[PDB]
């Protein structure tokens, strides 16, 4: 089992949330956290476009990267509940960027496959540190 899990094989993924928070704080890079499920078709459709998007793949290099098939113990990572796929951003100050939301009012951190441009904008927002 690789850490990539099909999200970006050329990327450097971190294994655990604890380690990812340490990396973010010590490197002054924001942390991007992708929650998904292998059995979820929504997760799989988003993964496909994410992995194939060269802009996302390149910009991802400026982040600490974590993808999870199981929820963390940090409630700040699910401000409107636990659902997948869900992409959360954390600032190097260890402040969860709950203000970096996607398109949808009912699922504030969900992305659909057509929402890659908005995802890019939100990654750029994450890079404007608090």
């Amino acid at each position: 089992q690789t850490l990539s899990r099909g999200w970006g094989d050329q990327l450097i993924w971190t294994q655990t949330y604890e380690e990812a928070l340490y990396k973010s704080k010590t490197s002054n890079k924001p942390l991007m956290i992708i929650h998904h499920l292998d059995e979820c078709p929504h997760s799989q459709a988003l993964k496909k476009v994410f992995a194939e998007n060269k802009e996302i793949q390149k910009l991802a290099e400026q982040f600490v990267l974590l993808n999870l098939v199981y929820e963390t113990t940090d409630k700040h990572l699910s401000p409107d509940g636990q659902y997948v796929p869900r992409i959360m951003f954390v600032d190097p100050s260890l402040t969860v960027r709950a203000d970096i939301t996607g398109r949808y009012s009912n699922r504030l951190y969900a992305y659909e496959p057509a929402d890659t441009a908005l995802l890019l904008d939100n990654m750029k927002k994450a890079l404007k540190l608090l």
Binding site: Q82, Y83, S93, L94, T95, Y104
Partner: peptide, 18 residues
């Protein structure tokens, strides 16, 4: 307060809200 999606599956940091 905006569009909705049904394309999800239901299962010491600070936080900054919108």
């Amino acid at each position: 307060d905006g569009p909705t999606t049904d394309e999800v599956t239901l299962q010491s940091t600070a936080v900054r809200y919108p």
